[PDB]
Design a protein around this ligand. Structure first.
Ligand SMILES: [Zn+2]
Ligand SMILES: [Zn+2]
Lengths: 304, 291, 304, 304
């Protein structure tokens, strides 16, 4: 497992890119990063980065106004941003459905009014609310149909046909199709999680991944930003910084043992927050090639 | 998911062919536990099973055995019902088991218990028993094999006649009552589970081998479709053969007459006859000891 | 409405004849009667009278042994009798299904082993136990499928088709077929109820009919035996008999006002119980032509 | 050798029953007969009679429509019929494989869509075309692998292991398994041949059997219908009939001397062709118990 998102950044088949991470763990950043890395690596395909965060993180990350109307980020003719409001208890799945169905209407609407078509969409999942809850209802209720359909086959079909397997077939057809909307091919859809080496973060991450696995949604990418690596930076000293990383190193080992076959890309900590297309691309380069605190120390103390 | 599982399975069996057993075992379980935690049983089942297979193929009973138990746990957690697929996985794993594995019996028990809880068989799935029986026999656990074969399939019946035949042959000093001690087991066991077909076939195969090896004095008696290999030097075998057919008639009179003519045998198989008389003749009165 | 079962006794289309009546109200009698009247009126069709009463009422009504093996009643080559044991809590309908499915296997089994085929079967419903409970499950669970199928159609089918009306069509197909096994055509299936002019009987009758109407099972025949009509019999007197009929007349009026458009055939009371093919046919003649206590008085004091 | 198919008709282990006979020798008849005899003798097992004859012989023999969808013959809840079209030069075995593989897909398909499972299938082989040609390729090509595997073991395996018996073991494994699909246990699979006492028929029979023996397929049953036995029928006379049987007797002796240890069941000639479930069962009874032209003469002049 290469601690990078190369295979994904250079993938031309993927058309559904998920990006989650509750806890103000730099979700917005990773999202813009993964979107830029894929757009630059595949200039022969249109990409769309959409967010639902009411804080308009994408507009504050790039430095330009992004609305419900998809607009190409200035300087790039391959990447586009979208900031919509996904809102402007009896039956499970319904609510989630309405929410997602609406976001997809905003997608097809922006592909007709200029933009034409985006090959791969970068979903910047909301900060809170399991917007992927409906990723299990369709398989749920369906399987119940199967228990329903079969059982409804009293002794027979000898006598059931004298008073009346189209049911056992159409069910299996409505079954697969449904399971094909969740499974949505691991080569076509994937989920990228973001976090940091901190107790609470791991707790949030561990559960998030469980939730996705119950959705059968492919997950094999864990982003961990804010890492110090204070044992290599050329300008040592500062116990305060060394102590903090000693703690981050503790958990990081729990992550490398918890997610052994996962793409755990460890991102470096930057002085201030990274904003602007420029500082973003230079920081997202580490998502393609591992960050080396021994040599890439310059690029970091550069964004400062 | 499907493309990811397949991949890792190689990097696992790569750690096994490299010697890294601990690494291979620890990693797989933690990852498997994750699937189970998300209720993605199906995925865990294939992963666990595959991992157990490789371990057993690498002569690593420790890990192999452990994984089998873990698999079973999921089986009960996923309420996996007893069917071809479900049984197949266990059969495939039982085949790679080392007859000397210190856990053998435990593994076997666990598998069978599962089959009992998720099937209509009070003692477990027949087919499954066929495999289990052979495994037990490889570890010299004859008595345990006998039981499973008794409650197995047609092949089990053949392997039960071979188990009894290879045992009879192992006896250095054969006697008239010796051949009965083995042969009777076939007649009684199958008659209890009321499997007349197996009782007759097991009988024919065993009585024919006995005739082609010991060359005893006999003569086949045929009457109304039925046959009774009358041995001139084995009364025990004659009695036993009549007992079989008698039960098939379910007629009290015949059962009483047969016992009254063979008083000695009626006391040797006291308990056994008492049962047969209740299952085939509706007799509630206990068996009065002749001697 | 003719107070008789003529239209039914002479019907060659009907192939399912129900006959119920809890309360030892002479169910067995009416059953054998309706079966004989139809068999004699249509000698060009095979009829089968089957009962589930453990008392073997049909064998005690005709005077011969009837078992699970259909046998032509002696003297008739058009009527046949069958006496089977319909037995030898989580999901509704199941249990009932198993019970009925089993009786139908006993039907087709007797149509292969000589008898070949019965055009119309006379079902002598059991004395107790709603053996027609499963006459509603099939429509029930099915309609639930429709609520399931439709709702499962989130906004679209625009997006539901991009990720995947065969469902809305096959449902309606499995729907009709099912509803065709309960409805089973009113011209093909009907239910005949039996009772007497007595409080408890009416109570039992009223509910029985409600139960059948919920099954959409056609019902328009109510048999009322044991009637006195003690105001016409040539040999009046006997206050005891006159008083009893004054009470039967009371309820009979409630029956003629409760079931105005129903075939309420009022049968006369016979001295002793009617048994033997002979006394049965002569008594069943009143099911074709109304009984007149002024003229048919002889036929009754004859069965005595 | 009992001149009957008793041992097979009462066998509960057999699950593959072949039935061949080119030459319009009454193959269809024997097939339906063997299927009915086994279904009636073992009501605790589901049987399936399938044909590939484009003339729909099974639908014309029973009197009902049979399609690719297995349907229980009316009146039997143990026997089922299947009529499929096995079609709707460089490598031997391939073509045959595709043909058989397809018929088996039609089997498992009818066991899922009601029917659940058939313990023993009665294969009514096609009239023409050796649909069992692929019953030798698997053993053929495999043995070639053995000559391939071994020879590929140059001097050694001393040096063959220095530059690189898993090959000699896996070969023997893929060897047995294969040979187990053809051999398919003589107690599990068998082949029933049908013919008549006539030159051409014998010629066709003799070769058919050779073909099967090269497939190692168990064969020990030869049906011979249309026999006259015109020397016993109560109503002698008719030289025309006596002369014909004198010729049939000639060949019949060649059959009893050619196939001494074979189950040569000699079936009687019927006035007209036997059709309908009824006339079939009564004629198939002779497959269980030998036909005696001296006593069973009635049963024959009955089917007329
Ligand atoms: Zn009175
Ligand atoms: Zn002639």
């Amino acid at each position: 497992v290469e601690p990078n998102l190369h295979s994904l950044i250079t993938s031309t088949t993927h058309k559904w890119i998920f990006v989650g991470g509750k806890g103000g763990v730099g979700k917005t950043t990773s999202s813009c990063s993964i979107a830029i890395q894929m757009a630059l690596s595949q200039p022969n395909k249109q990409f769309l980065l959409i967010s639902t965060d009411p804080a308009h993180n994408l507009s504050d990350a790039f430095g330009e106004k992004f609305g419900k109307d998809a607009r190409k980020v200035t300087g790039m003719n391959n990447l586009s941003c979208m900031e919509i409001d996904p809102s402007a208890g009896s039956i499970p799945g319904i609510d989630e459905a309405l929410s997602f169905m609406e976001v997809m209407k905003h997608i097809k609407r922006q592909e007709q009014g200029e933009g034409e078509t985006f090959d791969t969409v970068i979903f910047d999942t909301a900060p809170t609310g399991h917007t992927l809850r409906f990723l299990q209802l369709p398989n749920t209720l369906s399987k119940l149909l199967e228990k329903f359909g079969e059982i409804t086959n009293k002794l027979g079909p000898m006598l059931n046909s004298f008073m009346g397997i189209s049911g056992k077939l159409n069910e299996l057809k409505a079954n697969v199709e449904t399971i094909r909307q969740q499974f949505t091919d691991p080569d076509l859809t994937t989920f990228v999680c973001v976090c940091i080496s901190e107790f609470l973060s791991l707790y949030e991450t561990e559960r998030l991944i469980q939730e996705l696995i119950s959705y059968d949604m492919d997950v094999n990418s864990i982003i961990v930003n804010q890492l110090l690596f204070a044992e290599n930076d050329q300008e040592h000293n500062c116990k305060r910084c060394q102590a903090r990383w000693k703690m981050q190193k503790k958990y990081l080992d729990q992550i490398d043992e918890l997610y052994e076959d996962f793409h755990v890309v460890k991102m470096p900590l930057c002085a201030g927050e990274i904003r602007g297309l420029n500082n973003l691309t230079k920081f997202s380069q580490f998502l393609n090639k591992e960050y080396n605190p021994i040599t890439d120390g310059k690029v970091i103390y550069e964004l400062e | 998911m499907g493309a990811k599982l397949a991949k890792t399975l190689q990097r696992f069996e790569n750690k096994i062919k490299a010697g890294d057993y601990y690494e291979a075992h620890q990693t797989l379980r933690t990852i498997a536990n994750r699937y189970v935690r998300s209720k993605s049983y199906e995925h865990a089942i294939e992963l666990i099973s595959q991992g157990a297979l490789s371990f057993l193929k690498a002569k690593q009973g420790g890990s192999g055995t452990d994984l089998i138990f873990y698999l079973l746990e999921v089986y009960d957690l996923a309420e996996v019902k007893v069917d071809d697929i479900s049984v197949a996985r266990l059969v495939r794993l039982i085949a790679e088991l080392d007859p000397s594995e210190p856990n053998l019996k435990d593994v076997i028990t666990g598998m069978n218990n599962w089959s009992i809880k998720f099937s209509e068989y009070k003692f477990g799935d027949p087919y499954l028993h066929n495999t289990i029986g052979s495994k037990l026999l490889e570890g010299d656990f004859v008595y345990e094999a006998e039981r499973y074969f008794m409650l197995g399939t047609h092949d089990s019946m053949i392997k039960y006649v071979d188990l009894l035949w290879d045992w009879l042959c192992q006896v250095d000093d054969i006697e008239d009552s010796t051949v009965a001690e083995f042969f009777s087991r076939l007649v009684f066991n199958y008659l209890f589970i009321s499997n007349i077909s197996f009782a007759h076939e097991s009988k024919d195969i065993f009585l024919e081998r006995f005739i082609e090896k010991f060359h005893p004095k006999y003569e086949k008696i045929d009457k109304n479709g039925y046959e009774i290999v009358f041995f001139e030097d084995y009364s025990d075998l004659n009695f036993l053969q009549l007992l079989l057919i008698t039960c098939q008639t379910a007629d009290a009179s015949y059962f009483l007459n047969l016992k009254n003519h063979y008083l000695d045998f009626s006391q040797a198989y006291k308990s056994e006859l008492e049962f047969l008389g209740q299952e085939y003749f509706n007799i509630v009165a206990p068996k009065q000891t002749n001697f």
